[PDB]
């Protein structure tokens, strides 16, 4: 037959970089270095990257290029008994689309909010403020910074929600920003990679320009070198601790995207004899290199705050959305030409998420187009049907309690659910399908087989690597809370529906296909353990 292919090699490389490089490279990696002995954290981060992360990254990329199909068909064409893996992964990515784009909407709201010479989040004398407002971050819960109250009491209006039961009014300024996000995602994804592979040129490259600028602005700041000290001063007392190796393992596995069917779908439009092994190493490196660079951008500024603004580094060295929507903007408002750093900062955050949202959506579309040609012949219709569902339900995230809705999905939509999914991917490839066939498949593509190193990592390391994460992920479990709020019992179990909603397709479709193929049980396993190419 004939399947569409990238109009250029860079279009693919940028689509994969744009997917892999997002906010977690900015608001989590530097925190982990800071939290876990500085430069010493690079040791377990690098080991977990070379034995768990990149082996899984390389697998899906190779596996997607070789089978020329999306996530559902590929795993059906590989281990038919485990076609449910594809099903599981497709709607994990479907769930994530309900909260991830909320971050891009916030980034655009702060962008539109920065069109002035007096950035609003710098003062404590506005209508949205409390008597307990501080000019900069402290370490007492009831006394919040001027930037934290702007984000919480004006942008979010989160003070008006008693919990997830009380979502309250829809913020149509937010609802509008969210629509602009899905509009961009539409006119970039409706015509396929012909146009998608070109938008990533901007969304994946623009952040590097901003990083470059902010890197120079940060290092030229007084106190910049003090932040770099807090960032990278090594302390190997941590390497002996297990919770560090978990942070490294978990960040590695999540900063890269393996198993989400995104890389699968992306590599599926590669040429069969493309050197995907060269592509995996290059793209992996750039993802980690970007986090390492972004660390300087953040901590040069974080030191300037602790040096010239009189704050304790522990109070501003934070992670998650608080770092990009509260902490870093506060420092900008002190700098001259403040208005300039804001606009590029929030555009960087937007472009950092957009190209990741692209891959998640494309993983869904591609997977479904390769299984239901009715929607393959009607792409522009399917995406509008998809994105409108995303927008309508997305209005809940634009309510006054939308964060409680956001935090709920961020915990359950893809946390354990993807770990178990990739666990079977690794088992299906290395054990059911076979490293022999897999290596033989790769040789035919790139001309040489994988080294014994990669084969050992796919067969033993990656499973325990994922197991290592899933075990300790369950040990440190505690019910869902945000600030002084404790989610009700029913909301907790709701996230378990969402988690198991995907994973259940793995044993379900196994059962449904075991009961649909005729023969004896070993006669049925053998019919469901032989690939389509055979």
């Amino acid at each position, epitope marked *: 037959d004939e399947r569409e292919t990238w109009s250029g090699k860079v279009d693919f490389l940028l689509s994969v970089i744009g997917f892999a490089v997002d906010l977690a490279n900015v608001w989590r990696f530097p925190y982990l270095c800071y939290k876990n002995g500085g430069g010493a954290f690079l040791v377990p981060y690098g080991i977990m990257l070379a034995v768990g992360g990149i082996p899984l990254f390389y697998m899906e990329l190779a596996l997607g290029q070789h089978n020329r199909k999306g996530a559902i068909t590929c795993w059906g064409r590989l281990v038919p008994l485990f076609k449910g893996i594809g099903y599981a992964v497709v709607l994990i990515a479907f769930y994530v689309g309900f909260y991830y784009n909320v971050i891009i909407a916030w980034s655009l709201r702060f962008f539109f909010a920065s069109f002035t010479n007096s950035l609003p989040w710098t003062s404590c004398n506005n209508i949205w403020n409390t008597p307990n407002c501080r000019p900069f971050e402290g370490h007492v819960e009831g006394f919040q910074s001027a930037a934290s109250e702007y984000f919480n009491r004006y942008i979010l209006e989160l003070n008006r929600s008693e919990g997830i039961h009380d979502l309250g009014a829809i913020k149509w300024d937010m609802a509008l920003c969210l629509l602009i996000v899905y509009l961009i995602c539409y006119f970039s994804l409706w015509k396929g990679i012909s146009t998608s592979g070109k938008v990533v040129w901007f969304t994946a490259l623009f952040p590097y320009a901003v990083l470059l600028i902010l890197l120079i602005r940060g290092l030229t700041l007084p106190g910049s070198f003090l932040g770099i000290q807090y960032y990278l001063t090594p302390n190997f007392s941590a390497i002996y601790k297990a919770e560090v190796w978990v942070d490294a393992a978990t960040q590695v596995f999540f900063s890269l995207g393996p198993g989400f069917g995104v890389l699968l779908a992306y590599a599926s439009y590669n040429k069969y004899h493309n050197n995907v092994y060269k592509d995996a190493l290059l793209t992996s490196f750039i993802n980690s290199a970007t986090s390492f660079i972004a660390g300087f951008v953040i901590f040069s500024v974080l030191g300037y705050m602790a040096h010239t603004l009189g704050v304790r580094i522990e109070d501003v060295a934070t992670e998650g959305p608080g770092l990009v929507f509260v902490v870093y903007p506060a420092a900008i408002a002190t700098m001259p030409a403040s208005t300039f750093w804001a606009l590029i900062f929030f555009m960087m955050l937007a472009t950092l998420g957009l190209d990741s949202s692209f891959g998640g959506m494309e993983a869904i579309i591609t997977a479904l187009s390769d299984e239901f040609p009715k929607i393959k012949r009607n792409r522009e219709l399917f995406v509008a049907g998809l994105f409108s569902l995303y927008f309508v339900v997305g209005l809940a995230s634009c309510t006054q309690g939308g964060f409680y809705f956001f935090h709920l999905l961020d915990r359950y939509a893809a946390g354990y659910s993807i770990l178990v999914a990739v666990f079977f991917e690794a088992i299906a490839v290395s054990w059911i399908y076979g490293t022999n066939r897999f*290596s033989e498949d790769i040789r035919d593509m790139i001309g040489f087989p994988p080294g014994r190193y990669w084969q050992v990592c796919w067969r033993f390391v990656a499973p325990i690597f994922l197991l290592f994460i899933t075990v300790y992920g369950l040990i440190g479990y505690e019910p869902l809370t945000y600030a002084d709020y404790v989610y009700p019992s029913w909301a907790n179990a709701l996230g378990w529906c969402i988690a198991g909603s995907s994973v259940v397709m793995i044993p379900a479709v196994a059962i449904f296909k075991l009961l649909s193929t005729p023969g004896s049980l070993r006669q049925r396993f053998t019919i469901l353990t032989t690939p389509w190419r055979d």
Partner: antibody
């Protein structure tokens, strides 16, 4: 170390069939893609067929396709070439070569077995 | 198919001199897919140079490889009589795989 021994082959009549065999020893035969290369009596090297490690990827030259069948016995470590509709231009010495890495060529060759196709 | 032509066809050299042989392809070949074989009279071929310039195991350093695209060359710095043989190039970047037409190196006396 690695050793390859081609066997079978001698004189056939035009149209006849014949089956050549290569006995591998000294390495994990099932881990390496093998190929049949031949050399006409005018001393010209011509690649004939390649078979992948597991025998799932097969390539024929356009001069022998439909007539030659390459196969693999990873249990006994034997390589096979089944010939049918034999023509005189198929007269050559047939070499069994080991070449798993394309970026490395054929690093090991047998000693050849001779095939003469004449009436 | 990608025709590989070698010149010269026959070549006579006095021991110690410097020989150069060329291999010209009808279609560009990746520098990493071009190899060379040495075949002695009445014996089997042996892999000599792989990936344009890398010497195989047991190959003395007087041999070098060079080239790109459609033009490659094998060079022997100072020839020895144990180098008298026919040298074949090969491409492995396209099926059908193809061998060059050969260069026979003979000893001058």
């Amino acid at each position: 170390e690695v050793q390859l021994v081609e066997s079978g082959g001698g004189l056939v009549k035009p149209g006849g069939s014949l089956k050549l065999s290569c006995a591998a020893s000294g390495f994990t035969f099932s881990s390496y893609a093998m190929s049949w290369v031949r050399q006409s009596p005018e001393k010209r090297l011509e690649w004939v067929a390649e078979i992948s490690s597991g025998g799932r990827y097969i390539y024929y030259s356009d001069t022998v396709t439909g007539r030659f069948t390459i196969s693999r016995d990873n249990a006994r470590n034997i390589l096979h070439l089944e010939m049918s509709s034999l023509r005189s231009e198929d007269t050559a010495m047939y070499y069994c070569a080991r070449g798993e890495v394309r970026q490395r060529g054929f690093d090991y060759w047998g000693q050849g077995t001779t095939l003469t196709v004449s009436s | 198919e990608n025709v590989l032509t070698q010149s010269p066809a026959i070549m006579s050299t006095s021991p110690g001199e410097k020989v150069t042989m060329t291999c010209r392809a009808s279609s560009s070949v990746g520098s990493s897919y071009l190899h060379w074989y040495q075949q002695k009279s009445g014996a089997s071929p042996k892999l000599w140079i792989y990936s344009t310039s890398n010497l195989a195991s047991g190959v003395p350093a007087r041999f070098s490889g060079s080239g790109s695209g459609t033009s490659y060359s094998l060079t022997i710095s100072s020839v020895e009589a144990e180098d008298a043989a026919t040298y074949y190039c090969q491409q492995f970047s396209g099926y059908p795989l193809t061998f060059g037409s050969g260069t026979k190196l003979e000893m001058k006396r």
